[PDB]
Amino acid sequence: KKKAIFDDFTGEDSLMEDHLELREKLSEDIDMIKTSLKNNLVCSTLNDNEILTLSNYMQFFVFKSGNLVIKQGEKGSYFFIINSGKFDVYVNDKVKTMGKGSSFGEAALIHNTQRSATIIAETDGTLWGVQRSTFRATLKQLSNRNFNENRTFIDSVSVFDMLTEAQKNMITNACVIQNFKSGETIVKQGDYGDVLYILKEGKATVYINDEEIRVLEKGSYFGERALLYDEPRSATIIAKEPTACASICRKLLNIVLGNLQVVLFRNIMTEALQQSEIFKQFSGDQLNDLADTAIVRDYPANYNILHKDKVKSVKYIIVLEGKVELFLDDTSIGILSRGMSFGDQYVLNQKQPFKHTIKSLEVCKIALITETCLADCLGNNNIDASIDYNNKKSIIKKMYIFRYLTDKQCNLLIEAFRTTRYEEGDYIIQEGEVGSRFYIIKNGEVEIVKNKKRLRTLGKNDYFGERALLYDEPRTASVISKVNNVECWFVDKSVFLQIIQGPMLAHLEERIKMQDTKVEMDELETERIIGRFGTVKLVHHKPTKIRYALKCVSKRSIINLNQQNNIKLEREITAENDHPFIIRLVRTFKDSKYFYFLTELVTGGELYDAIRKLGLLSKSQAQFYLGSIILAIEYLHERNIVYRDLKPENILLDKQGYVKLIDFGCAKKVQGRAYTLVGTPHYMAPEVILGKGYGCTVDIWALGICLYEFICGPLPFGNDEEDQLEIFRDILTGQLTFPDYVTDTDSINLMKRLLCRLPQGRIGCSINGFKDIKDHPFFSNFNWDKLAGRLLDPPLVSKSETYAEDIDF
């Protein structure tokens, strides 16, 4: 017995196939398409070469009088431009009538949507047409290939060599394509240059003092200096044939990157310090400090920069430009070029005399690091204390339980650690006893043994015994010293509980208990339904009496919608999330008919109901909720996740009034530029709509939409609009205004900078990342440490609980 095969070959797409005819395009055809697309909502930002390519994908369609083109209520896919004849319209089976030059079905280019009108042909007329799939696919291909071409051209430009991978990708998105006709001047001699040009196609002639010097082709570039200095152009460059250039202006580069020269030297110094066996062990913040504080100096060629015994405060040097030679008395040790460095032994032993000599081999630039520079940046006169301090800090800043404590709290915790020794065979912890110490291995190896079964071996910088800080319980496993000379850092529970305060302790006490509880489906009892894909049940775990949420999703509903890859990806993202303001997944389950997600139960209600109870937010209330979202979003962007559906509906409050981001169905791990149109229209960024690619920046746009809601009340774009097209039009072209009762300069500026249409110029989307938002004057009185450390009073704490109402899982 064999199954038959069976739909979707009888829509409006199949109707257009019947009317399709072949037609070679004339000059009258292309020009007529170019004009209609340039006036259209999606294509008005596009250049001529993109519009020309799109214009070639237009198909020709022929209609006799009485033939239906579009019917009302049918799902729409094509966009049309009337080539000849008249076409009547029926608004609710009744309105307009339009002929050559006009267009319709614009919304179809963006999204699959029901047709408003129904257009019948009045006379023997013809249409130019294109389908959504082809249109979006074409924009995707134009943008992707443009970016990749421009990226490999950036790699050939030597002034950008010391940019990082992320920084090069950033400046690639700052490239503007510029097309030039034959005989057109690209740059003129004596003009003050602020633009770097790279030839993509064509040829240009270089003239100096009216004399023909040379010809530039694909891959040639000029104006490197124009990105650094403000000087006269050295030559006049005129296009010889039709020519395309990628250009980057200094103005946009300074927005994207800041001072290019500063960034390059910072990167050289930062990479040099990361090769040092001493400077390796310090944090990125400390290395950026050393880089930003180092004395930078130029020296001439064949110059003794440092000479045995005559050196005073200088302990370390990094070559930024040129070359120097390192000597010990008369013996040559080596040549240091860009990014190489010297002085480890003098950094470690700052009182010992300088015995080396550094002589320049050519004109050079050097970064000098002194005793004062080290003390100020590494925060101590003693270097071994600093190293020791940061070794502990690095380890605890990775752990959930310590990393959201404040800098004061974290510093008190680090100072409290003491050292103890153990020999081969010693039990550091014995299974059974009630523990009270947390351990970090400084030197040696230890075995973890649970119920006589070796679980794993831990070594230098691993940690154990964490739960004893939160709970008074018996120890679940023993920890035995593998070898002699084992040394641990340790801190006692009692000190941790002095440092930490009530709210944060309760958060950790609840979270770790529920996380670590091994839960089976046998052991759960449904209490009530709290959400209607599938259902969300408030469940109760009988052995521990801990309460959870259990989201159930129909396995048959997933197969029928081809969400098999998407549910795997949702699980993967939802599982990795470990942040206090993001919902925490405990476990997943699988059976014959369902996929289950078991999460923490969130009891404080929805954010969308909190803001309606509070009304328009005060500055501190808006700071609190926006700040919370910022930290959650920042967490995700650090892991290359774009959330894509940020809105108050997807944010719950916990018992304490702190927020939890939920619903990761729209989230994606970004690998390059994303193109699929996903989200809630009122919150969707313009770069999602326009279809030329996007990444993590879309969440920062939505953040500005949310802030506007909080302070002003209504949505900034499309507030009183149901129809999706008109919402999108307002997002793309509408004027951003504020009510008469919103006047706070810092609130207005932040909303304006967050709702910048160009993602490249949007606050938070430059080199400093979220730091620019966090340091914005709007947050000037806001303590980010206290937010994450649960030390702020929230705007709203609820009196009771409120709720709405193959595969490896």
Numbering used by the authors: 15 to 20, 23 to 110, 112 to 549, 552 to 824, 850 to 853
Please give sentences taken from the publication describing this entry:
Previous work has demonstrated that one particular kinase, known as cyclic guanosine-3′,5′-monophosphate (cGMP)-dependent protein kinase, or protein kinase G (PKG), has essential roles in multiple stages of the parasite life cycle. Selective pharmacological inhibition of Plasmodium falciparum PKG (PfPKG) blocks the egress of merozoites and gametes from erythrocytes, as well as inhibits the motility of ookinetes in the mosquito and invasion of hepatocytes by sporozoites. The cellular functions of parasite PKG are regulated by allosteric and cooperative binding of cGMP, similarly to how mammalian PKG is activated.
Here, we describe the complete atomic structure of PKG from two human malaria parasite species, P. falciparum and Plasmodium vivax. Despite being locked in an overall autoinhibited state, PfPKG–KD surprisingly exhibits many structural features of an active kinase, including: (i) interaction between the catalytic lysine K570 and E589 (on helix αCK); (ii) positioning of the helix αCK toward the ATP-binding site; (iii) an open (active) conformation of the activation loop; and (iv) intact hydrophobic spines. ΑAK in PfPKG makes multiple contacts with the N and the C lobes, some of which involve R809 as well as the C terminus of PfPKG–KD, and none of which have been observed in PKA. In site 1, the basic AIS in PfPKG is docked against the activation loop of the KD in a manner reported for PKA, with key lysines (K15 and K16) replacing homologous arginines (R94 and R95 in PKAR–RIa) in interacting with the P+1 loop on the KD. The third CNB, pCNB-C, stands out because a hydrophobic network consisting of Y363, H373, F371, and F359 occludes the cGMP-binding pocket.
